[PDB]
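Dataset card, provenance and construction

Sequences and ligand SMILES were collected as paired inputs. For each pair, a complete structure of the chain with the small molecule in place was predicted and serialized as structure tokens. The example below shows a pair involving chloride ion. Curators did not alter the output after generation; any descriptive sentences attached to a record were derived from the structure itself.
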Amino acid sequence: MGKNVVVLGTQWGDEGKGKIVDLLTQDAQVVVRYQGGHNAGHTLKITVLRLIPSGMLRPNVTCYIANGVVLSPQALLSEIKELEGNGINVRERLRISLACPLILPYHIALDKARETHRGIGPAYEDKVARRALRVGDLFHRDRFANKLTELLDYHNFVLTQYFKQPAVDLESLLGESLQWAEELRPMVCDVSACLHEHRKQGENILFEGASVINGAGFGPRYIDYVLGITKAYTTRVGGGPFPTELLDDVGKRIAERGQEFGAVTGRPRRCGWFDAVLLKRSIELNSISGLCVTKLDVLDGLEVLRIAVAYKDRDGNILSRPPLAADDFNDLLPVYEELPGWQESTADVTVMSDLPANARAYLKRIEEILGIPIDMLSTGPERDSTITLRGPFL
Amino acid sequence: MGKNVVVLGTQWGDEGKGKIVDLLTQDAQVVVRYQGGHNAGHTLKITVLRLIPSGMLRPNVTCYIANGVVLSPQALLSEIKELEGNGINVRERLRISLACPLILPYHIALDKARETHRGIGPAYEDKVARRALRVGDLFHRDRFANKLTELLDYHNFVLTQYFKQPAVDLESLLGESLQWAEELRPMVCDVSACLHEHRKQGENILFEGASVINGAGFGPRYIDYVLGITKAYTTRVGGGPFPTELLDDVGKRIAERGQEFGAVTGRPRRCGWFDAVLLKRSIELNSISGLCVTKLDVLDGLEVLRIAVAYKDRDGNILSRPPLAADDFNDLLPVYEELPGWQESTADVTVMSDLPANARAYLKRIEEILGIPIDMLSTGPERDSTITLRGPFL
Ligand SMILES: Nc1nc2c(ncn2[C@@H]2O[C@H](COP(=O)(O)OP(=O)(O)O)[C@@H](O)[C@H]2O)c(=O)[nH]1
Ligand SMILES: Nc1nc2c(ncn2[C@@H]2O[C@H](COP(=O)(O)OP(=O)(O)O)[C@@H](O)[C@H]2O)c(=O)[nH]1
Ligand SMILES: [Cl-]
Ligand SMILES: [Cl-]
Ligand SMILES: [Mg+2]
Ligand SMILES: [Mg+2]
């Protein structure tokens, strides 16, 4: 019997999940995308993949895009064709749920009309409202066209009347969708049934978070281990509350050493100390089994490190979890523990005993505070600069 | 340490879940509603409850309405006041997530406008579109009013312009919402944090399905047992595919003995044989641990029983799971096994060894086919006409 592993980030993104997933695919026979869309990409060896799991570059791996993914058919076909150019037999090992909702031009438009008071949101809205076109509809061209015209009679009304923005042309959408069914046909399937047959065959399955139960049709007690990818410090891209934010020379050093810059904008990310209050909530929500702590090497050379172990709100109440309401972060302050840093390099160290004593004590304290083990550790950007203390597929 | 149990029906509703949940609450210190709304009710002793869990009638139980529930504030307050009339101290033991989306008059209207080409759907639509008013907004009356007027500027446009139906009056909605904050205030909280503190205290928690992970903020590996409430035959209320449907005197007998009539309409439900193809998919999707088979007594006196173990599609392909697409049920037929019935009464039998041999063989075969145990069995409508072979909280 195999093991079923979910991998997700525990903070506010940018936790270094890509190379950890790539490493874990050496042990998986099956990799599953079950949530999200094509918002964030992953760069690897040959090419950026946003919908196709990176397990595709292992010859034995079957990759699944499960029903919880909303997909733009043209974004998917471009990724496919790109990998086909590099000589990957994609269509033999990529499988796509017939129940994926499509992201179409009008979803993107409603996104744009609303931003000025990538379609993923409006697509999920159509799905919840029981009106979304799906992959399976491509195979009934009569129904696809009927439902598309009828959906466009509404979304175009909303776009031009309410938002005073341009409509989406029905005829050009039918024209662009002409080849989608034939392009996707050999890959479409009942993904959940496939996953349960793999489970029956004892194969290892990796669920790659961009929930599993609804998004892949895969019940919760079959999940054997949840790996929480957790950077050794915290970053944030957007505005809003950041209790451990560093606005000084230490934060600037972290940003530089960790290359914490927007991949498209070049804008530096906000940086701050490790925040265990944030992590406690992530562990509870996701029943995280163990952590993969990443970018330890970025902290080399700091004289002291801090860990936020509580928050103190405006009244001086001590909080062990982040407040639900963003109002409560006003006049809210972190409560820190202080640990000594290390001067020795941890870059690309691959055995725990080669780490400096203060680095191991930092990691041990995170384990003590959070109550779950650090089962993996990344000490560099290279896939193999990774210590596996306990394998998630054990 | 306690156990965390999810209870759900495995078929198309009407599986007899109410009295099983009531029985299980004797072992739970905490009962959680995490999905759905006030669509279906449960009748019990003193009164129909649609939002408040029936654990409220046990003095030690804390009841939670978690963030995944969309709630009409006036429907909730009426249930509360009703139970208060029967002298239940509701407000001390009922807890409500600040993050529940509200169901408001305009949601119901959009329901009505769409049916003619109870608001639960449009409320979830608002939530997905990141625009839903929530319980927590009642406590910022300035923001509640600002967001309500702005939301109504849209939903009223859609109602009158698109659907040519009446608008919803903003001022009367503000008037009706005037007392909601003060009414709900002592009960509102961070439900997920509460559930994890109960979990830490080792208390038994019952999740009552009307998912758990998102709807209650409660990670999948903390779920210890999923109980699948499973009627000994199948019923359906709506139209559409029903492969084991019985259109004869046997189905009519089942309908009568099982009182299979719409609680409001009086219309008889469609009845049919036990369908293990349906059940296999339910078990996979929900990782069901064990079954509670209900209404065994309804089958007393039948000469033969059938169980659908596969489907045969139009081409004669043999299917082990129901097809995803409703098209594929056209010219689709069940594949049956036949078992002998029993003449002896099973009504209110409470020890397995008092059951007739053919009844135990029927149940054993369902276990063999489905590969999970029958851990509970209901033989009558009374809460205690129930055999517990293995307790879910074990
Ligand atoms: N210094 C350092 N960089 C890392 C580490 N892990 C990942 N990175 C880098 O951090 C960035 C984000 O990691 P990843 O999610 O794997 O890449 P992405 O999927 O392309 O965003 C990439 O530029 C990685 O090379 C690590 O432990 N140390
Ligand atoms: N004959 C019979 N009736 C049952 C059994 N279990 C439940 N019922 C009845 O079936 C109906 C549905 O059960 P339940 O879900 O507990 O009640 P509800 O929540 O009020 O819909 C009710 O009228 C119950 O009394 C059983 O094993 N045998
Ligand atoms: Cl699927
Ligand atoms: Cl909550
Ligand atoms: Mg990353
Ligand atoms: Mg019922």
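Derived descriptions for this record:
Chain A touches chain B at residues 98-99, 121-122, 124-125, 128-130, 136, 140, 154, 157-158, 161-162, 190, 192-193, 196, 211-214, 217-223, 225-226, 283-289, 321, 323-325, 327 (CB under 8 Å).
The pocket of magnesium ion (ligand 6) is lined by residues B 14-18 (CB under 6 Å).
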